[PDB]
């Protein structure tokens, strides 16, 4: 009795809610280039804070996805449009000795170029995956997407790379960071910590596996949704990073055509010809697969585990896809996913790989991009961190897992699992035995 109402401000109590998060860019770079300012995020471990997490449900993954789209749109906006290049192609492609690999070879056509009364013959090379065959004589070809979308050449001076990004909440909202070392994507976290901003997440763009990300604290971690076994994607996150290396040993020649926007095409190739390929530490790879199999048969009690390469679908999912700088790759990944199971740099694997220029935009089709050729020979090196698997149902008595993960949002889904955002509720009340004085 006599417990008079009292009020308290600055209260530590919060709730879940969506909000618009700040991005943050590096101090050096090539909206994004100079801003927002590079932070110095701190972090406290909180004593007894118990919070639940859900890496499938949280909103900010969608915001990452939208921001990536918007930034790509802004970067691509001032670049040239390749619409006048849509003319009929009359090409036979038998000049160089190693003809069959590319089969677009000085590939001829007409362009309007300097004077609009004039029309001039030109030619350049193309990889046949960027080409479709018209009816009648095979010499008649067309650009692949030109009957369905408008193609923009990438701005060569604005080459973009997986620059790390830190995400910062606004005032009144705090980002909760689970420090648990064996978090499965759902359930309580007893090791809650808070920060101004997230660490520097990179916008990696790849399929069937991811190339640049973080690593797990424990052993290889399995994360999947648990509403039903009939899942879309299963995320496997490596603790032991494994190196992968790739090469494009042939030397390219850049050539230019002006519309006065400078269109770039592929000139004559220099040096003897090889098919672009990759390399993998052979023992390390299927040591890691053995670890992943041992982890994976924990969930599934008493059934075999086996891998096969993906079947059907576009080139973006039938092959591992990634990019060394300003070139794009599609590596025929049959050998890597052919083990089977039941209830340290020797013997290096190599795998064949193809490259193509005209890329349907990753998140969604209907808008087309053209990457100008990169001169000379190219290699890039990365160290993978996880796999994107999907389970083939139906087959009784035998599980089967195959490389999928073509949907671009899953890459950032597998990396933003750390965090959650909460609205602060600074105002609260309580009973107490003291009242105002008149």
């Amino acid at each position: 009795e006599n417990l008079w109402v009292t009020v308290y401000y600055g209260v530590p109590v919060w709730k879940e809610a969506k909000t618009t998060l700040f991005c943050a860019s590096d101090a050096k770079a090539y909206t994004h280039a100079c801003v927002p300012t590079d932070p110095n995020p701190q972090e406290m471990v909180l004593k007894n804070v118990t919070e639940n997490f859900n890496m499938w449900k949280n909103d900010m993954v969608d915001q990452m996805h939208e921001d990536v789209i918007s930034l790509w749109d802004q970067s691509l906006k001032p670049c040239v449009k390749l619409t006048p290049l849509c003319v009929t192609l009359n090409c036979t492609n038998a000049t160089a000795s190693n003809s069959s690999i590319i089969e677009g070879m000085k590939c001829s056509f007409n362009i309007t170029t300097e004077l609009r009364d004039k029309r001039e013959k030109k030619n350049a090379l193309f990889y046949k995956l960027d080409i479709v065959q018209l009816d009648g004589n095979s010499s008649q070809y067309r650009l692949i997407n030109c009957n369905t979308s408008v193609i923009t050449q990438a701005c060569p001076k604005v080459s973009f790379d997986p620059i790390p990004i830190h995400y910062c909440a606004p005032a009144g909202y705090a980002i909760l960071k689970c420090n648990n070392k064996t978090f499965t994507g759902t359930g309580p976290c007893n090791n809650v910590s808070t920060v101004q901003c997230t660490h520097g997440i990179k916008p990696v763009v790849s399929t069937q596996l991811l190339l640049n990300g973080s690593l797990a604290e424990g052993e290889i971690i399995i994360r999947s949704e648990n509403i039903t076994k009939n899942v879309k994607t299963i995320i496997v996150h490596l603790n032991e990073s494994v190196k992968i290396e790739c090469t494009r040993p042939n030397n390219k020649t850049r050539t230019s055509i002006r519309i006065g926007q400078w269109f770039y095409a592929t000139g004559q190739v220099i040096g003897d010809i090889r098919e672009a390929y990759c390399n993998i530490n052979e023992s390390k790879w299927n040591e890691t697969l053995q670890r992943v199999s041992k982890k994976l048969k924990e969930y599934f009690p008493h059934k075999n585990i086996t891998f096969q390469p993906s079947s059907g679908g576009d080139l973006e999912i039938t092959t591992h896809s990634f990019n060394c700088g300003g070139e794009f790759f599609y590596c025929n990944t049959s050998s890597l996913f052919n083990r089977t199971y039941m209830a340290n740099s020797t013997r290096t694997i190599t795998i064949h790989c193809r490259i193509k220029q005209i890329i349907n935009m990753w998140q969604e089709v209907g808008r087309a991009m053209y990457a100008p050729p990169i001169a000379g020979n190219i290699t890039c090196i990365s160290n993978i961190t996880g796999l994107l698997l999907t389970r083939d149902g139906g087959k009784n008595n035998t599980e089967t897992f195959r490389p999928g993960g073509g949907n671009m949002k899953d890459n950032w889904r597998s990396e933003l699992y750390k965090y959650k955002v909460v609205k602060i509720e600074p105002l609260g009340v309580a009973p107490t035995r003291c009242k105002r004085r008149v």
Partner: nanobody
Amino acid sequence: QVRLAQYGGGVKRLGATMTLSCVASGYTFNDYYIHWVRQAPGQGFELLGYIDPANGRPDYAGALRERLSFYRDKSMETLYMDLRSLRYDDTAMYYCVRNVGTAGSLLHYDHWG
């Protein structure tokens, strides 16, 4: 509002190969998995497989993985199914059906063809 029309079918000769199709009315082509389910006469339904329209990934029932094939043409919002070497028992009715998918799971069918 959403419609899933179908074409093809009729009589098919024994041992032949046949092609169905479904035209997706405008809801959003890339957001919903599509399943191909059938019904033999005097029997309950059963599933053949599902195709993700976005990336074109198929997946089949274990008893028909040699004979089936799915693929799509995203521009036309159109789907296709190829079944090879029809046998007698495959005399049946074949349906397209939209699937309601969450961010990480597939749940059920809402609109049939």
